[PDB]
Amino acid sequence: FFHHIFRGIVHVGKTIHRLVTG
Q1: How many Å apart are CA 14 and CA 9, to the nearest integer?
Q2: DSSP string, the chain
Q3: Which own/partner pairs from 18-22 qualify as long-range (CB within 8 Å, at least 24 positions apart)?
């Protein structure tokens, strides 16, 4: 549960960082 919740946070931030970074 905790590992899954933390993993989703990393992907969410990673997605935003990728979109912002050209």
Answers
A1: 8
A2: -HHHHHHHHHHHHHHHHHHH--
A3: none
Q: Looking up tokens 């993993």, which residue turns up?
A: 7
Tell me, what amino acid is at 9? I
Spatial distance between the Cα atoms of 9 and 4, rounded to a whole number of angstroms: 9
Least Cα distance to 2 among 10, 15, 14, 17 occurs for 10
What is the residue whose two structure tokens read 């899954």? 4
One-letter amino acid at 2 equals: F
